[PDB]
Amino acid sequence: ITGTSTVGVGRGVLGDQKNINTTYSTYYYLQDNTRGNGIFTYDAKYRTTLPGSLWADADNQFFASYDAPAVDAHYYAGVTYDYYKNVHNRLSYDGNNAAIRSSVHYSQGYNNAFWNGSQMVYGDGDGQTFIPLSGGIDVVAHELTHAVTDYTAGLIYQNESGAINEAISDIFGTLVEFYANKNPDWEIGEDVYTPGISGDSLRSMSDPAKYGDPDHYSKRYTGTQDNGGVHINSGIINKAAYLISQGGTHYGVSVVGIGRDKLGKIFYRALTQYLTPTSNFSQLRAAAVQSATDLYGSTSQEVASVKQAFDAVGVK
Ligand SMILES: O=C(O)C[C@H](NC(=O)OCc1ccccc1)C(=O)O
Numbered sequence: 001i002t003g004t005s006t007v008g009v010g011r012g013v014l015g016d017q018k019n020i021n022t023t024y025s026t027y028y029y030l031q032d033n034t035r036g037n038g039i040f041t042y043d044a045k046y047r048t049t050l051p052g053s054l055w056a057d058a059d060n061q062f063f064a065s066y067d068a069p070a071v072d073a074h075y076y077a078g079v080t081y082d083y084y085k086n087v088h089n090r091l092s093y094d095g096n097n098a099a100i101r102s103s104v105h106y107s108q109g110y111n112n113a114f115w116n117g118s119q120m121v122y123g124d125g126d127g128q129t130f131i132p133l134s135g136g137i138d139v140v141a142h143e144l145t146h147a148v149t150d151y152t153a154g155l156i157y158q159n160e161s162g163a164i165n166e167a168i169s170d171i172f173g174t175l176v177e178f179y180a181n182k183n184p185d186w187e188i189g190e191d192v193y194t195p196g197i198s199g200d201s202l203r204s205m206s207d208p209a210k211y212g213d214p215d216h217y218s219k220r221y222t223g224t225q226d227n228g229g230v231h232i233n234s235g236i237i238n239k240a241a242y243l244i245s246q247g248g249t250h251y252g253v254s255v256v257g258i259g260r261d262k263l264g265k266i267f268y269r270a271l272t273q274y275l276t277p278t279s280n281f282s283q284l285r286a287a288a289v290q291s292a293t294d295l296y297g298s299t300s301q302e303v304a305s306v307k308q309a310f311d312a313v314g315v316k
């Protein structure tokens with residue numbers, strides 16, 4: 001809606017206090033006018049009708065436990081916006097500053113989050129497997145990254161192209177986690193996953209096999225569950241991306257790490273200029289090699305590391 005830009009203060013899902021950009025018009029709304037065409041956060045009110053109600057608050061203060069997921073979805077959307085803009089010169093997910101919309105309190109005990117083709121959507125979780133999912137910055141950025149991929153490479157959500165889709169969201173979710181620099185790591189979902197158990201997560205890029213996910217092509221899943229294993233075989237690519245950045249020896253293949261920034265650069269370029277909707281793992285390797293070549297030259301260390309990492313995970 002129309003109104004004045006203001007600044008609220010609230011607490012996130014993990015009890016942390018933070019400032020949020022709000023909009024004032026009778027009520028204080030979760031509308032950030034500082035970023036692109038705006039970031040809008042809605043209340044789905046435990047139902048599944050979307051988007052639900054633009055979040056309205058009487059006093060620009062967001063400390064109620066009910067507020068917390070909206071606080072983080074709003075804040076973390078802004079962080080992710082900043083990453084793509086400051087790091088990749090990308091303006092929102094479509095490159096033209098499209099409004100970013102998120103709904104929270106979707107359904108009841110909903111242990112999931114997603115991009116619905118138009119907006120982000122976060123369950124509260126059931127309190128056992130998940131607490132409210134927007135509490136995880138790598139979750140928020142994974143989801144918004146799905147929007148980026150949809151507008152760019154458009155990787156179809158199935159089989160190897162689908163697993164590439166997932167890895168890209170896991171890669172950029174992690175890189176955004178590092179960008180904000182609060183407890184960053186190469187795990188996925190640790191901040192909102194299983195509040196009863198410390199140290200675990202939904203998936204691991206550093207060691208996919210920690211959670212039953214393949215870390216080598218020879219161990220790929222070939223059946224039909226999970227749209228041909230898009231959340232499973234992503235481990236192969238997650239591990240490759242981990243290797244490219246951090247380095248290491250994997251199945252006896254040594255990889256010289258080149259760090260986060262360049263991993264980001266190579267993959268962002270791969271995603272936006274070389275991947276197509278039907279790209280398989282093998283074409284992803286080629287896309288990444290050509291991206292590293294464009295950026296650093298065909299005889300560079302960067303190129304040699306991309307090749308070593310994909311060799312390491314068994315992708316030719
Ligand atoms: O299948 C979909 O499109 C929805 C699925 N959602 C999902 O896995 O929710 C939990 C979660 C999300 C991001 C990071 C860690 C955990 C996805 O985004 O892949």
Ligand SMILES: [Ca+2]
Binds near residue numbers: 057059
């Ligand atoms: Ca309030």
Ligand SMILES: [Ca+2]
Binds near residue numbers: 184185
């Ligand atoms: Ca973390």
Ligand SMILES: [Ca+2]
Binds near residue numbers: 177
């Ligand atoms: Ca993480």
Ligand SMILES: [Ca+2]
Binds near residue numbers: 197198201
């Ligand atoms: Ca846990």
Ligand SMILES: [Zn+2]
Binds near residue numbers: 142
């Ligand atoms: Zn995903």
